Write a protein that binds this DNA or RNA. Structure first.
Ligand SMILES: [Mg+2]
Ligand SMILES: [Mg+2]
Ligand SMILES: [Mg+2]
Ligand SMILES: [Mg+2]
Ligand SMILES: [Mg+2]
Ligand SMILES: [Mg+2]
Ligand SMILES: [Zn+2]
Ligand SMILES: [Zn+2]
Lengths: 132, 103, 218, 343
RNA sequence: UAUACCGCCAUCUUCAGCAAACCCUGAUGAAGGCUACAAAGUAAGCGCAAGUACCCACGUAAAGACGUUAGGUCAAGGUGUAGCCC
């Protein structure tokens, strides 16, 4: 019995999404990686820095868009430009949404001295994969 | 109000409805059968005791011989004998006042 | 209100669909319906229906047989004229083909295969929320191969469904509404019952069609 | 550190400790329970220590058709906001933790006199609001299993009734109390027993019977008598709609068997119309309030019998020495006639 | 303080059962629900299984639920409670 990135089977009143429902040994088999970079490949370097910076990015953005997200993020780093993709809910105002979008993008750019962009996809209620 | 029109008033109906007054009251006591003698009185030195009976908690009500449709609420319409105070949920003092008023 | 009048009109009349035209004690004796199992296979509640015994066998009272069969045909025909759902049961494998085929000739439905646990009680969960359970049950064989009361009579007694089973000396006619004493085992009697039900329900259906056509005219 | 920090749900789990040793075996704890709370839902995302005024999220963006500008909330206004937010949090916590008043039924910490409201609507659609529900008793049944040992299974017994002579009992077993309540309620509403009554408040005649070493003796009574019987039978009498009778239980005291035998008797009791139709005579009631006047109750639907019944003298009848004592009056007991509660 | 815990794993497991939700039997008790030439069981869902990785479809890996051992770990890290807070 191993407990690793999995949900305990309940009576069937727990909405669960794809990535957190599926096991961590289904990553390459029935999932995709949240981030995409080449530091893991051979010949590259700075992989530890990549991991630290993307963890801090995910934490900071989760906490500066709190209560609206309903799933993990998608990171897409093509050379220099960084791209973020999020799924959120539509309870707060587009005013606040755009304000925080610009705020976070400017902060990330000024911190990492890197061109950054981020996109968000609206959902009325978080999609559920199954009831476990 | 000293007259008996507080009963005909609308607050009485919404507060009670069709049931009698004693039907709503409930006694807190020891286990099983309650005591055979109710409390002596519900008010003392212009002070009310916890868990008072309904006729005592509702100060607007008045024990008067003339409030007929209130008096005959306790004594059964089917049996002329009055109910006892442990049944009606009221204390012995106001129960005796009610007995003398009904007589 | 006239719809209720039409629904109630056949009630006041006795033998209104002419169900007596079908059966006669001659035909019953020819089909050997009067037979019964041995006295060892006798049953208490079946005692009063036995006319007598001979050679360790049982004989059915044919007057009572005809009375109960008349009542059964009348009830089934009333329900057919009212479009009340009918459902046949014959757990006997000896006649499943013929019974399903006469059910096809009638238009009504049947279940001769193995009966599943709680098929009637839990039918909502099995089929769906909105399902019209049948309004009348009939039994060409009340007992199963193990000689046990088929669970359908119990289910009907519970859910207030009327039942009409042909009862043999081994059967339990207590829960049955219109139990018909007879010979469950003989193929002649089985075919007779099937043809009688064919005629009855088909006459009821065609007469309902006639009456509704007459009212469309009027 | 900030990198060491992490999301809330796992902290809440680690703090509440719902599972891991305490919850299993049913040992639990000594009445200590950490209440769940959500801090993100409470405060709006805008405010902080430095009270910058945000036109994007904190302040409306446009005022008088003029774009706003970033500004400073003075320290007095900051203290006002802090004070009113403290007040709001205290009010939220007050509304959160409060009393719970389930009306006292038979006694405290007992599920006897409490009603769960009418049954739930059916799937096809069947409102049973006319029905009222009551919980007769609750118990903690235990059976053991191979690997996990003792299994706790809440069994409950419930009754339901109109107040119109129609009612039904049932029982429900489940691991959860509310689930058992729901199951028992559904089964009771689906399994109903109807019984007739004479004049809306009495049984047709007194009955003495037994069921599984549980002797029952119910006695018809006149008007204004009340219900001086067991508390369960009083509750189900309220459900049925009868207002007065007497009853006594002798032998064992097992409320389920009591109810089975009681409904059996109340179902097997004979109506007076049925009695007249069976015998072939006119039923005649006589009262103590009314003088020597025969009040015809019912007549046989069929033809009346010509010959009346013969004089039945010294009939062979089995009765109870207790009733004999109570009738002769020599019996004495402090526990018989008490000024008990209302009905 | 692992006898508050989260997180992470040993164990039977070289297992295959676990089960929301309904119905039925036992006089409406704890409990049980199997007979296929078939007699009251129906089953969401999980797991097993299947497929996926290596050289295949076998094999090896992986996976291996509900739960026992208050199993180990407040010393990966955090956290409830109790303390030091010259
Ligand atoms: Mg392992
Ligand atoms: Mg108490
Ligand atoms: Mg331990
Ligand atoms: Mg496998
Ligand atoms: Mg492995
Ligand atoms: Mg240990
Ligand atoms: Zn007083
Ligand atoms: Zn036979």
């Amino acid at each position: 019995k191993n407990r690793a990135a999995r949900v305990r089977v309940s009576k069937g009143d727990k909405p669960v999404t794809y990535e957190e429902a599926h096991a961590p040994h289904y990553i390459a088999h029935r999932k995709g990686w949240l981030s995409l970079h080449t530091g893991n490949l051979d010949g590259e370097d700075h992989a530890a820095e990549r991991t630290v910076e993307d963890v801090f990015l995910r934490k900071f953005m989760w906490g500066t868009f709190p209560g609206c997200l309903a799933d993990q993020l998608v990171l897409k780093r093509r050379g220099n430009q960084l791209e973020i993709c999020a799924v959120v809910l539509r309870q707060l105002s587009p005013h606040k949404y755009y304000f925080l979008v610009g705020y976070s993008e400017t902060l990330l750019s000024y911190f990492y001295k890197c061109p950054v962009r981020l996109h968000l996809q609206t959902v009325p209620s978080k999609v559920v994969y199954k009831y476990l | 109000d000293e007259p008996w029109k507080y009963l005909e008033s609308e607050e009485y109906q919404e507060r009670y409805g069709s049931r009698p007054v004693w039907a709503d009251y409930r006694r807190n006591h020891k286990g099983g059968v309650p005591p055979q003698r109710t409390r002596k009185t519900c008010i003392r030195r212009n002070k009310v005791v916890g868990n008072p009976c309904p006729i005592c908690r509702d100060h607007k009500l008045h024990v008067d011989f003339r409030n007929v449709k209130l008096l005959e609420q306790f004594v059964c319409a089917h049996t002329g004998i009055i109910f006892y105070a442990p049944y009606t949920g009221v204390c012995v003092k106001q129960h005796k006042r009610l007995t003398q008023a009904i007589q | 209100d006239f719809n209720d009048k039409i629904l109630n009109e056949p009630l006041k009349h006795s033998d209104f669909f002419n169900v007596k035209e079908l059966f006669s004690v001659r035909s019953l004796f020819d089909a050997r319906v009067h037979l019964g199992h041995k006295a060892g296979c006798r049953h208490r509640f079946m005692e009063p229906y036995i006319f007598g015994s001979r050679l360790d066998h049982d004989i059915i009272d044919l007057e009572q047989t005809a009375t109960h069969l008349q009542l059964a045909l009348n009830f089934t025909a009333h329900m057919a004229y009212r479009k009340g759902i009918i459902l046949f049961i014959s757990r006997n494998r000896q006649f499943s083909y013929l019974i399903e085929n006469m059910a096809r000739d009638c238009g009504e439905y049947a279940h001769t295969r193995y009966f599943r646990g709680g098929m009637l009680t839990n039918a909502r969960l099995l089929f769906g929320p909105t399902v019209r359970l049948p309004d009348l049950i009939i039994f060409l064989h009340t007992l199963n191969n193990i000689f046990e009361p088929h669970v359908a009579v119990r289910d009907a007694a519970k859910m207030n469904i009327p039942t009409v089973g042909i009862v043999d000396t081994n059967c339990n006619p207590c829960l049955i509404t219109y139990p018909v004493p007879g010979n469950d085992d003989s193929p002649l009697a089985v075919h007779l019952y099937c043809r009688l039900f064919q005629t009855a329900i088909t006459r009821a259906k065609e007469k309902r069609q006639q009456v509704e056509a007459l009212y469309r005219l009027q | 550190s900030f990198f060491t920090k992490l999301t809330a749900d796992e902290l809440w789990k680690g703090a509440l400790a719902e599972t891991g040793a305490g919850a299993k075996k049913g040992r639990g704890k000594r009445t200590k329970k950490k209440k769940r709370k959500d801090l993100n839902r409470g405060q709006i995302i805008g405010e902080g220590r430095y009270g910058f005024l945000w036109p994007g999220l904190n302040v409306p963006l446009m005022k008088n058709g003029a774009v706003q500008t970033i500004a400073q909330r003075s320290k007095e206004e900051q203290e006002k906001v802090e004070a009113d937010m403290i007040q709001q949090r205290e009010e939220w916590d007050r509304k959160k933790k409060m009393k719970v008043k389930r009306e006292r039924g038979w006694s405290g910490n007992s599920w006897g006199g409490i009603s769960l409201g009418p049954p739930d609507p059916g799937p096809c659609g069947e409102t049973y609001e006319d029905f009222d529900t009551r919980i007769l008793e609750v118990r903690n049944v235990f059976t053991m299993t191979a690997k996990e040992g003792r299994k706790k299974s809440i069994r409950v017994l419930v009754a339901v009734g109109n107040g119109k002579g129609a009612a039904g009992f049932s029982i429900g077993k489940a691991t959860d109390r509310m689930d058992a309540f729901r199951k028992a309620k559904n089964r009771a509403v689906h399994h109903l027993h109807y019984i007739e009554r004479y004049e809306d408040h009495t049984i047709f005649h007194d009955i003495s019977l037994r069921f599984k070493r549980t002797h029952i003796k119910m006695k018809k009574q006149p008007k204004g008598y009340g219900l001086r019987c067991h508390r369960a039978i009083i509750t189900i009498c309220r459900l049925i709609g009868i207002k007065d009778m007497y009853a006594k239980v002798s032998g064992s005291i097992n409320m389920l068997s009591l109810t089975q035998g009681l409904f059996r008797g109340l179902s097997r009791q004979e109506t007076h119309q049925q009695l007249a139709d069976k015998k072939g005579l006119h039923v005649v009631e006589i009262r103590e309030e009314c003088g020597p006047l025969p009040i015809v109750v019912a007549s046989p639907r069929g033809p009346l019998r010509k010959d009346p019944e013969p004089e039945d003298e010294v009939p062979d009848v089995k009765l109870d020495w207790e009733d004999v004592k109570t009738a002769q009056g020599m019996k004495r007991s402090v526990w018989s006639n008490l000024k008990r509660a209302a009905t």
